[PDB]
Amino acid sequence: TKRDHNKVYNVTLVNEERGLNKTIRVHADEYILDAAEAQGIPLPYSCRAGACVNCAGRIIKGTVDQSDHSFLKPKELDAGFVLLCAAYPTSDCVISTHEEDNLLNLA
Ligand code: FES
């Protein structure tokens, strides 16, 4: 899938419990975690391969593409959950971080 590098989105990472609210620039062909790391923002992660839930976030605003290989169900995707290690922005976004436990609780 061709994703264009010079297309750049404003990705606001938010965590109310922790008082996090930081907006970074993320290229269309870059995973959100990898951008946050390049720009000095630590986010939770474990496998970094799309194959766990440790890096889970949840979309508040906008859109993302979750990589096909990611181990998220369509139901979970439809609920707004994202694995940031393996997701590309497709719009200016607001995403709440540290959403592992809420993903695990999704019925
Ligand atoms: S860190 Fe395992 S899915 Fe992202």
Side-chain angles (χ1 to χ4, degrees):
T1 303
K2 212 271 173 257
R3 307 182 174 89
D4 211 329
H5 189 68
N6 49 54
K7 186 135 57 193
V8 188
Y9 300 105
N10 293 324
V11 176
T12 301
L13 298 165
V14 183
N15 188 269
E16 184 177 14
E17 172 185 353
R18 288 170 183 78
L20 170 69
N21 195 305
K22 179 59 181 180
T23 303
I24 59 166
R25 295 284 281 183
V26 188
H27 300 261
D29 68 339
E30 180 175 37
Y31 293 146
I32 294 163
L33 182 59
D34 292 342
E37 289 193 348
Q39 289 173 59
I41 303 178
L43 292 178
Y45 67 83
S46 181
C47 75
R48 302 191 67 165
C52 81
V53 288
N54 190 265
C55 70
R58 196 178 194 168
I59 299 165
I60 289 169
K61 189 175 181 287
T63 60
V64 310
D65 285 341
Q66 191 71 53
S67 181
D68 170 86
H69 75 277
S70 300
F71 290 24
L72 274 181
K73 301 202 286 293
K75 160 178 174 185
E76 292 161 347
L77 283 169
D78 181 66
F81 290 103
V82 53
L83 300 182
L84 293 181
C85 75
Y88 301 98
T90 52
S91 78
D92 296 323
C93 277
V94 181
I95 300 171
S96 63
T97 62
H98 304 76
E99 291 276 347
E100 177 182 6
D101 291 334
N102 291 331
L103 175 50
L104 284 166
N105 275 355
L106 190 67

XYZ file of all heavy atoms in Angstrom:
825
model
N 0.879 -1.185 0.000
C 0.000 0.000 0.000
C 0.887 1.196 0.000
O 1.688 1.355 0.910
C -0.924 0.061 1.224
O -1.721 -1.141 1.298
C -1.835 1.268 1.105
N 0.732 2.047 -1.009
C 1.508 3.265 -1.124
C 0.922 4.274 -0.157
O -0.238 4.584 -0.226
C 1.462 3.816 -2.570
C 2.697 4.555 -3.056
C 2.670 6.056 -2.740
C 4.015 6.684 -3.093
N 4.879 6.952 -1.895
N 1.762 4.709 0.778
C 1.492 5.783 1.712
C 2.561 6.811 1.485
O 3.735 6.520 1.398
C 1.521 5.273 3.159
C 0.631 4.081 3.398
C 0.628 3.628 4.809
N -0.362 2.550 4.987
C -0.126 1.261 4.832
N 1.067 0.777 4.436
N -1.127 0.427 5.072
N 2.164 8.037 1.436
C 2.975 9.100 0.991
C 3.792 9.810 2.136
O 3.216 10.455 3.012
C 1.917 10.053 0.400
C 2.426 10.827 -0.687
O 3.644 11.065 -0.564
O 1.615 11.218 -1.574
N 5.109 9.759 2.134
C 5.853 10.342 3.229
C 5.705 11.861 3.478
O 5.820 12.361 4.613
C 7.327 9.987 3.059
C 8.177 10.351 4.241
N 8.058 9.718 5.443
C 9.203 11.219 4.368
C 8.945 10.198 6.286
N 9.655 11.124 5.649
N 5.538 12.607 2.437
C 5.434 14.064 2.630
C 4.014 14.491 3.027
O 3.730 15.667 3.154
C 5.908 14.799 1.386
C 5.277 14.235 0.163
O 4.085 14.153 0.102
N 6.081 13.758 -0.761
N 3.140 13.514 3.241
C 1.844 13.770 3.857
C 1.948 13.560 5.344
O 2.248 12.501 5.758
C 0.846 12.839 3.261
C -0.549 13.083 3.689
C -1.458 13.037 2.497
C -1.362 11.713 1.739
N -2.031 11.792 0.400
N 1.699 14.606 6.140
C 2.064 14.656 7.545
C 0.840 15.140 8.324
O 0.192 16.154 7.984
C 3.315 15.522 7.859
C 3.739 15.384 9.256
C 4.498 15.205 6.985
N 0.519 14.366 9.370
C -0.591 14.609 10.226
C -0.195 15.030 11.614
O 0.819 14.636 12.144
C -1.459 13.336 10.268
C -2.010 12.889 8.981
C -1.507 11.793 8.272
C -2.972 13.682 8.364
C -2.034 11.446 7.057
C -3.501 13.335 7.146
C -3.015 12.235 6.472
O -3.537 11.830 5.235
N -1.066 15.852 12.186
C -1.006 16.219 13.598
C -1.682 15.144 14.425
O -2.871 14.905 14.309
C -1.729 17.532 13.865
C -1.053 18.707 13.230
O 0.160 18.755 13.168
N -1.822 19.734 12.907
N -0.895 14.439 15.254
C -1.386 13.336 16.094
C -1.259 13.783 17.520
O -0.191 14.017 17.986
C -0.624 12.071 15.843
C -1.096 10.959 16.793
C -0.861 11.596 14.429
N -2.375 14.010 18.168
C -2.398 14.411 19.562
C -2.591 13.177 20.439
O -3.543 12.436 20.253
C -3.560 15.370 19.821
O -3.400 16.508 18.975
C -3.543 15.820 21.267
N -1.585 12.928 21.290
C -1.627 11.810 22.202
C -2.073 12.336 23.543
O -1.470 13.294 24.039
C -0.195 11.253 22.311
C 0.334 10.730 20.975
C 1.794 10.541 21.047
C -0.345 9.447 20.580
N -3.091 11.712 24.135
C -3.783 12.183 25.316
C -3.926 11.063 26.357
O -4.358 9.949 26.070
C -5.253 12.597 25.010
C -5.925 13.156 26.253
C -5.374 13.564 23.861
N -3.686 11.403 27.619
C -3.952 10.493 28.681
C -4.418 11.312 29.863
O -3.638 12.019 30.494
C -2.817 9.557 29.052
C -3.282 8.518 30.058
O -3.172 8.737 31.228
N -3.892 7.496 29.619
N -5.705 11.277 30.128
C -6.221 12.076 31.164
C -5.697 11.748 32.536
O -5.383 12.682 33.263
C -7.776 12.009 31.179
C -8.436 12.891 32.183
C -9.942 12.861 32.119
O -10.539 11.959 31.478
O -10.501 13.749 32.765
N -5.578 10.472 32.874
C -5.081 10.072 34.168
C -3.665 10.570 34.445
O -3.358 10.973 35.571
C -5.121 8.547 34.251
C -4.437 7.961 35.489
C -4.358 6.414 35.514
O -4.961 5.783 34.616
O -3.670 5.853 36.430
N -2.851 10.645 33.400
C -1.464 10.986 33.568
C -1.173 12.428 33.233
O -0.047 12.892 33.413
C -0.614 10.074 32.708
C -0.584 8.697 33.251
C 0.060 7.721 32.242
N 0.048 6.359 32.685
C -0.984 5.555 32.650
N -2.157 5.959 32.153
N -0.815 4.290 33.075
N -2.169 13.164 32.765
C -1.948 14.526 32.410
C -1.157 14.767 31.128
O -0.537 15.834 30.937
N -1.268 13.794 30.225
C -0.541 13.836 28.941
C -1.385 14.482 27.897
O -2.561 14.114 27.729
C -0.159 12.458 28.442
C 0.399 12.334 27.003
C 1.791 12.979 26.946
C 0.431 10.858 26.441
N -0.829 15.427 27.181
C -1.482 15.996 26.002
C -0.397 16.598 25.134
O 0.119 17.669 25.432
C -2.534 17.037 26.365
C -3.463 17.354 25.180
O -3.023 17.702 24.139
N -4.744 17.258 25.382
N 0.013 15.904 24.086
C 1.172 16.286 23.304
C 0.853 16.004 21.860
O 0.373 14.928 21.524
C 2.321 15.406 23.749
C 3.604 15.617 23.047
C 4.159 17.025 23.163
C 5.472 17.179 22.392
N 5.898 18.589 22.580
N 1.123 16.985 20.984
C 0.848 16.800 19.537
C 2.138 16.690 18.788
O 3.040 17.492 19.000
C 0.015 17.938 18.919
O -1.208 18.046 19.643
C -0.278 17.709 17.479
N 2.255 15.650 17.993
C 3.428 15.376 17.193
C 3.030 15.318 15.737
O 1.878 15.062 15.417
C 4.129 14.114 17.626
C 3.222 12.891 17.541
C 4.670 14.296 19.028
C 3.971 11.554 17.632
N 4.007 15.503 14.875
C 3.823 15.374 13.435
C 4.188 13.967 13.003
O 5.267 13.488 13.304
C 4.761 16.329 12.686
C 4.458 17.804 12.924
C 3.216 18.291 12.155
N 3.331 18.598 10.730
C 2.300 19.077 10.041
N 1.113 19.278 10.580
N 2.391 19.381 8.744
N 3.273 13.273 12.323
C 3.468 11.883 11.923
C 3.259 11.750 10.449
O 2.227 12.154 9.948
C 2.536 10.929 12.669
C 2.901 9.479 12.363
C 2.618 11.196 14.163
N 4.249 11.194 9.752
C 4.093 10.975 8.338
C 3.137 9.879 8.017
O 2.975 8.936 8.808
C 5.435 10.614 7.707
C 6.438 11.667 7.881
N 6.694 12.557 6.879
C 7.243 11.989 8.898
C 7.600 13.417 7.277
N 7.994 13.070 8.483
N 2.515 9.947 6.830
C 1.489 8.956 6.467
C 2.058 7.519 6.394
O 1.314 6.559 6.557
C 0.857 9.304 5.149
N 3.372 7.402 6.160
C 4.016 6.124 6.041
C 4.785 5.704 7.262
O 5.691 4.850 7.187
C 4.925 6.116 4.803
C 6.117 7.008 4.924
O 6.066 7.919 5.742
O 7.076 6.719 4.157
N 4.460 6.277 8.383
C 5.186 6.059 9.639
C 4.215 5.565 10.701
O 3.129 6.100 10.826
C 5.736 7.447 10.035
C 6.513 7.550 11.243
C 7.093 8.917 11.445
O 6.444 9.954 11.127
O 8.182 8.957 12.090
N 4.554 4.528 11.452
C 3.775 4.125 12.577
C 3.808 5.195 13.696
O 4.828 5.825 13.916
C 4.272 2.823 13.187
C 4.121 1.604 12.324
C 5.050 0.600 12.383
C 3.052 1.426 11.478
C 4.910 -0.559 11.667
C 2.918 0.242 10.751
C 3.850 -0.691 10.833
O 3.686 -1.874 10.121
N 2.677 5.408 14.368
C 2.555 6.447 15.360
C 3.579 6.284 16.453
O 4.173 7.284 16.862
C 1.113 6.534 15.880
C 0.189 6.998 14.747
C 1.054 7.430 17.074
C -1.285 6.759 14.968
N 3.791 5.046 16.951
C 4.755 4.812 18.049
C 6.124 5.280 17.608
O 6.861 5.915 18.362
C 4.860 3.316 18.451
C 5.807 2.937 19.614
C 5.434 3.629 20.912
C 5.725 1.450 19.880
N 6.483 4.930 16.377
C 7.846 5.186 15.866
C 8.037 6.695 15.774
O 9.072 7.222 16.095
C 8.078 4.552 14.486
C 8.103 3.048 14.545
O 8.280 2.468 15.633
O 7.993 2.394 13.528
N 6.986 7.418 15.379
C 7.076 8.920 15.365
C 7.228 9.466 16.779
O 8.003 10.383 17.014
C 5.848 9.531 14.712
N 6.474 8.924 17.740
C 6.460 9.434 19.118
C 7.863 9.166 19.686
O 8.527 10.041 20.274
C 5.438 8.739 19.959
N 8.414 8.014 19.347
C 9.739 7.726 19.829
C 10.788 8.605 19.220
O 11.634 9.125 19.942
C 10.095 6.292 19.634
C 9.244 5.522 20.621
C 9.703 4.139 20.753
O 10.534 3.706 19.923
O 9.209 3.513 21.682
N 10.703 8.872 17.928
C 11.656 9.754 17.270
C 11.588 11.145 17.833
O 12.595 11.837 17.874
C 11.425 9.798 15.791
N 10.437 11.552 18.330
C 10.260 12.903 18.834
C 10.284 12.964 20.350
O 9.815 13.953 20.989
C 8.939 13.444 18.315
C 9.081 13.710 16.835
C 7.792 14.080 16.206
O 7.153 15.050 16.588
N 7.373 13.271 15.262
N 10.841 11.911 20.940
C 11.130 11.922 22.346
C 10.022 11.704 23.346
O 10.181 12.058 24.524
N 8.904 11.115 22.913
C 7.759 10.829 23.797
C 7.674 9.357 24.065
O 7.396 8.557 23.122
C 6.418 11.235 23.159
C 6.433 12.703 22.787
C 5.223 10.873 24.061
C 5.131 13.079 22.121
N 7.814 8.965 25.349
C 7.721 7.514 25.604
C 6.255 7.097 25.706
O 5.440 7.746 26.316
C 8.439 7.305 26.932
C 9.193 8.554 27.110
C 8.338 9.649 26.530
N 5.951 6.002 25.055
C 4.622 5.406 25.069
C 4.807 3.957 25.514
O 5.892 3.382 25.298
C 4.007 5.434 23.663
C 3.666 6.777 23.154
C 3.125 6.696 21.756
C 2.603 7.377 24.045
N 3.742 3.323 26.052
C 3.883 1.950 26.405
C 4.016 1.038 25.206
O 3.391 1.246 24.167
C 2.621 1.665 27.180
C 1.627 2.630 26.692
C 2.428 3.864 26.394
N 4.869 0.049 25.341
C 5.040 -0.954 24.327
C 5.684 -2.186 24.939
O 6.269 -2.140 26.029
C 5.830 -0.460 23.121
C 7.246 -0.174 23.520
C 8.216 -1.196 23.599
C 7.635 1.128 23.853
C 9.503 -0.905 23.994
C 8.927 1.397 24.266
C 9.840 0.402 24.313
O 11.122 0.715 24.708
N 5.556 -3.263 24.236
C 6.145 -4.544 24.611
C 6.770 -5.143 23.350
O 7.950 -4.901 23.019
C 5.133 -5.495 25.286
O 5.719 -6.724 25.673
N 5.946 -5.796 22.533
C 6.467 -6.551 21.375
C 6.906 -5.641 20.229
O 7.809 -5.975 19.456
C 5.398 -7.537 20.893
S 4.002 -6.815 19.960
N 6.249 -4.506 20.063
C 6.501 -3.590 18.938
C 6.227 -4.196 17.557
O 6.824 -3.757 16.589
C 7.894 -2.939 19.000
C 8.159 -2.152 20.285
C 9.422 -1.279 20.272
N 9.228 -0.201 19.317
C 9.946 0.884 19.231
N 10.971 1.070 20.059
N 9.658 1.769 18.273
N 5.395 -5.225 17.506
C 5.220 -6.001 16.287
C 3.767 -6.199 15.938
O 3.464 -6.969 15.077
C 5.890 -7.355 16.468
N 2.858 -5.530 16.628
C 1.446 -5.699 16.369
C 0.771 -6.928 16.978
O -0.329 -7.282 16.562
N 1.484 -7.637 17.846
C 1.129 -8.942 18.240
C 0.870 -9.041 19.739
O 0.966 -10.094 20.362
C 2.241 -9.891 17.847
N 0.591 -7.934 20.361
C 0.176 -7.908 21.761
C -0.851 -6.775 21.935
O -1.430 -6.330 20.956
C 1.384 -7.872 22.741
S 2.196 -6.233 23.035
N -1.115 -6.342 23.161
C -1.992 -5.192 23.342
C -1.344 -4.069 24.130
O -2.023 -3.132 24.547
C -3.365 -5.589 23.947
C -4.235 -6.345 22.913
C -3.199 -6.346 25.272
N -0.062 -4.229 24.417
C 0.565 -3.370 25.349
C 0.584 -1.880 24.949
O 0.439 -0.980 25.802
C 1.990 -3.850 25.642
C 2.594 -3.122 26.767
O 3.286 -2.173 26.593
N 2.452 -3.668 27.906
N 0.720 -1.638 23.670
C 0.739 -0.301 23.147
C -0.618 0.298 22.775
O -0.657 1.365 22.151
C 1.627 -0.249 21.944
S 0.855 -1.135 20.546
N -1.676 -0.341 23.206
C -3.000 0.022 22.762
C -3.303 1.496 23.048
O -3.012 2.009 24.103
C -4.075 -0.820 23.357
N -3.937 2.151 22.075
C -4.570 3.430 22.256
C -5.990 3.327 21.784
O -6.471 2.285 21.341
N -6.696 4.429 21.867
C -8.072 4.538 21.433
C -8.299 5.878 20.758
O -8.002 6.926 21.295
C -9.030 4.230 22.559
C -10.439 3.951 22.075
C -11.383 3.594 23.162
N -12.605 3.033 22.684
C -13.504 2.450 23.396
N -13.385 2.414 24.677
N -14.540 1.919 22.772
N -8.870 5.809 19.548
C -9.153 7.037 18.772
C -10.259 7.799 19.460
O -11.294 7.279 19.683
C -9.556 6.677 17.355
C -8.430 5.936 16.657
C -10.058 7.920 16.621
C -8.952 5.250 15.376
N -10.035 9.063 19.703
C -11.032 10.055 20.129
C -11.526 10.856 18.917
O -12.709 11.047 18.798
C -10.423 10.990 21.191
C -10.244 10.247 22.483
C -11.321 12.196 21.423
C -9.415 10.976 23.501
N -10.613 11.217 18.007
C -10.897 12.012 16.800
C -10.014 11.500 15.690
O -8.866 11.283 15.913
C -10.582 13.544 17.018
C -11.014 14.456 15.942
C -10.736 15.875 16.420
C -11.178 16.907 15.392
N -10.161 16.782 14.311
N -10.573 11.408 14.475
C -9.853 11.114 13.265
C -9.783 9.666 12.941
O -10.528 8.872 13.457
N -8.837 9.349 12.065
C -8.736 8.048 11.503
C -7.297 7.540 11.455
O -6.381 8.317 11.294
C -9.338 7.967 10.053
O -8.617 8.897 9.222
C -10.808 8.267 10.063
N -7.176 6.219 11.528
C -5.905 5.567 11.389
C -6.081 4.329 10.529
O -7.178 3.771 10.406
C -5.307 5.107 12.717
C -5.312 6.209 13.743
C -5.951 3.832 13.154
N -5.025 3.887 9.906
C -4.980 2.547 9.397
C -4.137 1.662 10.294
O -2.970 1.882 10.595
C -4.424 2.445 7.990
C -5.396 2.920 6.926
O -6.633 3.002 7.181
O -4.865 3.256 5.841
N -4.780 0.610 10.721
C -4.111 -0.404 11.460
C -3.511 -1.390 10.513
O -4.201 -1.923 9.664
C -5.061 -1.140 12.381
C -4.336 -2.063 13.413
C -3.620 -1.335 14.479
O -4.198 -0.492 15.160
N -2.338 -1.576 14.581
N -2.209 -1.684 10.649
C -1.561 -2.611 9.712
C -2.304 -3.932 9.703
O -2.779 -4.401 10.731
C -0.105 -2.840 10.098
O 0.498 -3.707 9.181
N -2.390 -4.539 8.527
C -3.106 -5.815 8.347
C -2.628 -6.930 9.306
O -3.427 -7.734 9.781
C -2.871 -6.345 6.865
C -3.359 -7.770 6.633
O -4.574 -7.957 6.321
O -2.518 -8.706 6.680
N -1.338 -6.960 9.608
C -0.809 -8.070 10.409
C -1.123 -7.955 11.917
O -0.811 -8.865 12.727
C 0.696 -8.143 10.235
C 1.441 -7.077 10.970
N 1.606 -5.814 10.448
C 2.096 -7.093 12.162
C 2.330 -5.092 11.281
N 2.641 -5.848 12.323
N -1.709 -6.807 12.290
C -1.968 -6.558 13.633
C -2.987 -7.558 14.211
O -3.980 -7.952 13.522
C -2.482 -5.150 13.823
O -1.508 -4.216 13.362
N -2.776 -7.893 15.480
C -3.633 -8.853 16.203
C -4.708 -8.103 16.982
O -4.720 -8.166 18.204
C -2.757 -9.660 17.199
C -1.783 -10.660 16.556
C -1.340 -10.536 15.296
C -1.190 -11.655 17.335
C -0.445 -11.465 14.765
C -0.290 -12.584 16.811
C 0.070 -12.489 15.529
N -5.529 -7.345 16.240
C -6.763 -6.651 16.730
C -7.866 -7.170 15.868
O -7.734 -7.234 14.660
C -6.865 -5.118 16.603
C -6.314 -4.225 17.615
C -6.571 -2.776 17.242
C -6.740 -4.545 18.996
N -8.975 -7.481 16.507
C -10.233 -7.877 15.835
C -10.948 -6.784 15.221
O -10.892 -5.688 15.696
C -11.189 -8.588 16.860
C -10.660 -9.824 17.518
C -11.746 -10.730 18.065
C -12.345 -10.153 19.319
N -11.346 -10.141 20.410
N -11.681 -7.078 14.146
C -12.516 -6.029 13.647
C -13.410 -5.335 14.616
O -13.523 -4.104 14.528
C -13.378 -6.722 12.585
C -12.512 -7.810 12.095
C -11.735 -8.268 13.281
N -13.976 -6.029 15.556
C -14.814 -5.440 16.615
C -14.063 -4.384 17.439
O -14.626 -3.432 17.917
C -15.270 -6.625 17.539
C -15.777 -6.406 18.987
C -16.170 -7.791 19.558
C -16.552 -7.754 21.005
N -16.783 -9.159 21.488
N -12.809 -4.668 17.643
C -11.978 -3.816 18.474
C -11.578 -2.554 17.684
O -11.624 -1.451 18.204
C -10.759 -4.546 18.908
C -11.134 -5.665 19.886
C -10.123 -6.776 20.091
O -9.182 -6.862 19.293
O -10.379 -7.629 21.004
N -11.295 -2.752 16.412
C -11.007 -1.690 15.497
C -12.237 -0.770 15.413
O -12.163 0.478 15.497
C -10.693 -2.300 14.114
C -9.295 -2.863 14.096
C -9.072 -3.702 12.850
C -8.320 -1.711 14.209
N -13.406 -1.376 15.243
C -14.627 -0.609 15.126
C -14.922 0.208 16.404
O -15.527 1.264 16.317
C -15.777 -1.566 14.736
C -17.094 -0.867 14.573
O -17.230 -0.043 13.648
O -17.983 -1.169 15.388
N -14.526 -0.314 17.558
C -14.612 0.403 18.840
C -13.608 1.525 19.071
O -13.665 2.206 20.125
C -14.498 -0.581 19.982
N -12.673 1.664 18.148
C -11.711 2.705 18.187
C -10.361 2.341 18.696
O -9.486 3.214 18.722
N -10.139 1.078 19.017
C -8.844 0.722 19.546
C -7.825 0.627 18.422
O -8.164 0.277 17.288
C -8.911 -0.567 20.359
C -9.639 -0.381 21.642
C -10.913 -0.823 21.761
C -9.037 0.198 22.730
C -11.589 -0.646 22.925
C -9.671 0.371 23.891
C -10.987 -0.050 23.987
N -6.600 1.039 18.742
C -5.494 1.059 17.827
C -4.287 0.372 18.559
O -4.254 0.352 19.810
C -5.280 2.518 17.261
C -5.148 3.604 18.306
C -4.144 2.623 16.282
N -3.372 -0.307 17.841
C -2.082 -0.716 18.366
C -1.112 0.284 17.733
O -0.775 0.168 16.532
C -1.813 -2.180 18.023
C -2.771 -3.168 18.546
C -2.387 -4.573 18.201
C -2.868 -3.049 20.022
N -0.606 1.215 18.547
C 0.164 2.313 18.017
C 1.477 1.905 17.392
O 2.048 2.644 16.582
C 0.376 3.317 19.149
C -0.882 4.009 19.641
C -0.589 5.038 20.767
C -1.641 4.721 18.574
N 2.029 0.763 17.824
C 3.240 0.239 17.176
C 3.093 -0.155 15.747
O 4.071 -0.420 15.110
C 3.888 -0.874 17.985
S 2.929 -2.388 17.828
N 1.863 -0.250 15.273
C 1.588 -0.825 13.981
C 0.451 -0.103 13.235
O -0.187 -0.628 12.360
C 1.336 -2.299 14.076
N 0.230 1.167 13.584
C -0.824 1.984 13.003
C -0.290 3.241 12.363
O 0.531 3.930 12.949
C -1.811 2.384 14.085
N -0.784 3.564 11.200
C -0.428 4.787 10.503
C -1.596 5.803 10.632
O -2.752 5.446 10.543
C -0.375 4.455 9.021
C 0.583 3.399 8.566
C 0.169 2.117 8.351
C 1.918 3.714 8.420
C 1.043 1.151 7.889
C 2.811 2.762 7.989
C 2.353 1.491 7.728
O 3.240 0.514 7.298
N -1.307 7.083 10.769
C -2.401 8.083 10.770
C -2.896 8.211 9.359
O -2.111 8.157 8.416
C -1.669 9.341 11.286
C -0.278 9.148 10.705
C 0.015 7.713 10.878
N -4.199 8.456 9.260
C -4.769 8.849 7.998
C -5.559 10.151 8.063
O -6.183 10.548 7.104
C -5.657 7.750 7.397
O -6.607 7.315 8.339
C -4.816 6.536 6.991
N -5.425 10.848 9.164
C -5.986 12.168 9.351
C -5.295 12.812 10.543
O -4.536 12.155 11.250
C -7.457 12.096 9.610
O -7.716 11.729 10.900
N -5.558 14.088 10.757
C -5.161 14.691 11.993
C -6.013 13.970 13.011
O -7.235 13.763 12.774
C -5.362 16.185 11.998
C -4.522 16.907 11.012
O -3.343 16.547 10.766
O -5.118 17.820 10.327
N -5.368 13.515 14.095
C -5.907 12.537 15.064
C -5.779 12.982 16.496
O -4.882 13.697 16.812
C -5.109 11.219 14.950
S -5.642 10.125 13.630
N -6.686 12.500 17.350
C -6.508 12.591 18.773
C -6.691 11.169 19.273
O -7.697 10.529 18.982
C -7.529 13.524 19.464
C -7.266 13.581 20.939
C -7.425 14.919 18.875
N -5.714 10.650 20.008
C -5.706 9.275 20.439
C -5.336 9.243 21.918
O -4.324 9.820 22.335
C -4.637 8.478 19.653
C -4.966 8.529 18.158
C -4.598 7.031 20.074
C -3.890 7.975 17.331
N -6.138 8.530 22.709
C -5.873 8.345 24.130
C -4.991 7.122 24.269
O -5.175 6.090 23.619
C -7.153 8.198 24.951
O -7.900 7.056 24.597
N -3.967 7.252 25.123
C -2.928 6.268 25.276
C -3.241 5.414 26.530
O -4.129 5.649 27.291
C -1.570 6.926 25.447
O -1.567 7.723 26.648
C -1.285 7.818 24.343
N -2.418 4.382 26.693
C -2.519 3.509 27.883
C -3.884 2.898 27.953
O -4.481 2.774 28.984
C -2.113 4.220 29.207
C -0.724 4.820 29.197
N -0.416 5.996 28.534
C 0.424 4.415 29.800
C 0.861 6.269 28.710
N 1.385 5.314 29.472
N -4.360 2.410 26.785
C -5.709 1.828 26.709
C -5.799 0.294 26.766
O -6.857 -0.255 26.599
C -6.400 2.351 25.425
C -6.742 3.821 25.479
C -8.038 4.127 26.157
O -8.857 3.193 26.415
O -8.224 5.319 26.506
N -4.679 -0.340 27.123
C -4.607 -1.804 27.233
C -5.738 -2.421 28.030
O -6.436 -3.328 27.579
C -3.215 -2.230 27.811
C -3.154 -3.755 28.004
C -1.857 -4.275 28.597
O -1.027 -3.489 28.971
O -1.710 -5.485 28.726
N -5.928 -1.920 29.254
C -6.931 -2.495 30.143
C -8.378 -2.278 29.560
O -9.205 -3.127 29.682
C -6.742 -2.015 31.581
C -5.441 -2.588 32.238
O -4.898 -3.682 31.885
O -4.925 -1.907 33.127
N -8.637 -1.151 28.903
C -9.940 -0.939 28.361
C -10.179 -1.822 27.153
O -11.290 -2.313 26.963
C -10.141 0.506 27.995
C -10.218 1.400 29.214
O -10.634 1.006 30.280
N -9.773 2.574 29.049
N -9.131 -2.148 26.420
C -9.256 -3.076 25.284
C -9.570 -4.493 25.815
O -10.415 -5.163 25.335
C -7.968 -3.073 24.465
C -7.862 -4.075 23.312
C -9.090 -4.025 22.386
C -6.569 -3.765 22.583
N -8.829 -4.914 26.815
C -9.021 -6.192 27.450
C -10.415 -6.323 28.033
O -10.953 -7.456 28.022
C -7.980 -6.381 28.566
C -6.596 -6.711 28.112
C -5.613 -6.536 29.246
C -6.430 -8.060 27.493
N -11.018 -5.209 28.524
C -12.394 -5.198 29.073
C -13.472 -5.083 28.086
O -14.617 -5.117 28.448
C -12.688 -3.983 29.885
C -12.263 -4.074 31.265
O -11.792 -5.101 31.735
N -12.391 -2.926 31.964
N -13.129 -4.923 26.823
C -14.148 -4.746 25.826
C -14.895 -6.023 25.709
O -14.318 -7.117 25.540
C -13.551 -4.357 24.477
C -14.565 -3.939 23.452
C -15.189 -2.624 23.906
C -13.953 -3.823 22.079
N -16.213 -5.912 25.726
C -17.015 -7.123 25.710
C -17.375 -7.571 24.261
O -17.534 -8.751 24.032
C -18.246 -6.973 26.625
S 3.677 -3.274 21.496
Fe 2.739 -5.272 21.070
S 1.127 -4.732 19.690
Fe 2.182 -2.861 19.951
